[PDB]
């Protein structure tokens, strides 16, 4: 959405006044259409909430397989590890490394899934990798009041921090923004709220000192849990583009990675762009 830089400005400006007013009426009607879209999006939010219970079983079973708490059934073992393999190929793959009982579960599942998504891969630094190795599950749930959703990262006991769950929460507006009504294209983020990470000594990879000596932000995935402030409490459009980037990463994790985690583990979902 966009001032005078509208693609067809010259045509609009050259329009008779009585036609310009019909076009104004269409702008009014477009605001009404947008309000209906708003209500539609609220219905979809409730559908996602309703379907959390339907997804829950497959997600818990994935958690159990990954944590080694349950073993595969023969039906699952007969599911090909990768699709699109010649028959000798699948058999050689299954014969390229012998079983190892010392190996519980699927080491580094969520770390590999997260780093295989291109957008999330851009936020993971080398010093984040061993911390994310302790990630045992990633979960999401949505709410209606207050409206939005949360992502929760469940960490096994680890030398980096004491938290068992790190939580990111997004508060969304589903109503047309009043600051720009015609710019509506779905729920927009009002607020991002993170979690205080209780770092062990010497482990806070998100913070560095420079020399007066000042503490500054270091690059780390874990800045996901110190999200930018909004005008509510806030450059001015830097923490605003930062907030969009943080919300876009939220959406990737909620919409794409959590429902399709194993396809990112294998790398069977790719992007050329």
């Amino acid at each position: 959405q966009h001032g005078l830089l509208s693609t067809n400005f010259d045509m609009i400006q050259a329009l008779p006044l009585n036609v310009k007013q019909r076009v104004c009426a269409l702008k009014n009607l477009q605001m009404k259409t947008i309000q209906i879209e708003s209500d539609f999006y609220k219905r979809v939010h409730e559908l996602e909430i309703e379907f959390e219970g339907k997804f829950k079983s497959t997600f818990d079973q994935r958690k159990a397989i990954v944590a080694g708490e349950v073993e595969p059934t023969k039906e699952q073992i007969d599911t090909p590890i990768l699709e699109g393999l010649e028959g000798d190929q699948l058999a050689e793959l299954y014969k390229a490394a012998e079983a190892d009982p010392s190996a519980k579960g699927i080491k580094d599942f969520w770390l590999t899934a997260l780093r295989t998504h291109d957008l999330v891969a851009e936020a993971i630094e080398e010093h984040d990798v061993p911390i994310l190795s302790y990630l045992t599950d990633v979960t999401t749930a949505a709410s209606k009041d207050p409206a939005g959703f949360k992502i929760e990262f469940h960490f096994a006991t680890n030398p980096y921090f004491k938290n068992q769950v790190l939580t990111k929460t997004y508060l969304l507006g589903f109503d047309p923004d009043a600051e720009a009504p015609l710019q509506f294209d779905g729920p927009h983020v009002i607020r991002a709220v993170g979690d205080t990470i209780e770092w062990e000594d010497g482990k806070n990879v998100t913070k560095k000192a420079v020399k007066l000596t000042k503490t500054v932000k270091a690059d780390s995935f874990f800045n996901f849990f110190e999200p930018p402030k909004s005008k509510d409490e806030r450059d001015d459009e830097q923490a605003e583009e930062f907030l969009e980037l943080d919300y876009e990463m939220g959406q990737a994790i909620r919409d794409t990675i959590i429902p399709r985690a194993v396809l990112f583990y294998t790398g069977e979902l790719q992007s050329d762009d």
Binding site: D118, E122, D272, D273
Partner: protein
């Protein structure tokens, strides 16, 4: 390490449509592409320090190429990179440049592996993609010709070793990295 396997396969299927490639050879090709790209970008960043605003364009890459690609390889890589930047500044960014290798993915691998506050231009990603695609292409043809010389339709690491040794500049490059 990133993975270029799909792009490597597409290049293979251009220069040797009938010919396949094994997992071991594909792994090696991925190492080749990443190990060259990291050298090229290591020079681009240090060159961009001598640029007041940390800007990176096709020149920092055209110079990193000369610093690294031996003799005739550099001449052909630079020619391909300029022809591609021409095609780009005039569908996707890679098709715009006439390439199989990923322009946008490499643009991003260029911000993360080089400057931060400055400006890395799209022509730099176009140039880098053409360099990598050209090098991949030469290696794949040489090994594919070789695998056809042995009456086989599948490049293996052995054919790779043969194509690399029977060309002095590729040999040099591999050893150097």
């Amino acid at each position: 390490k990133e993975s270029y396997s799909v792009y490597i396969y597409r290049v293979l299927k251009q220069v040797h449509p009938d010919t396949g490639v094994s997992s071991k050879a594909m792994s090696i090709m991925n190492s080749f592409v990443n190990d060259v790209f990291e050298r090229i970008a290591a020079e681009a960043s240090r060159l961009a320090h001598y640029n007041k605003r940390s800007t990176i364009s096709s020149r920092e890459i055209q110079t990193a190429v000369r610093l690294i690609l031996p003799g005739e390889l550099a001449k052909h890589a630079v020619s391909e990179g300029t022809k591609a930047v021409t095609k780009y500044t005039s569908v996707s960014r890679s098709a715009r440049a006439g390439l199989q290798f990923p322009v946008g993915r490499i643009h991003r691998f260029l911000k993360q592996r080089t400057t931060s506050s400055g400006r890395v231009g799209a022509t730099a990603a176009v140039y880098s993609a053409a360099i990598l695609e050209y090098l991949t292409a030469e290696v794949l043809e040489l090994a594919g010709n070789a695998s056809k010389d042995l009456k086989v339709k599948r490049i293996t690491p052995r054919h790779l070793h043969l194509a690399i040794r029977g060309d002095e500049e590729l040999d040099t490059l591999i050893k150097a990295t």
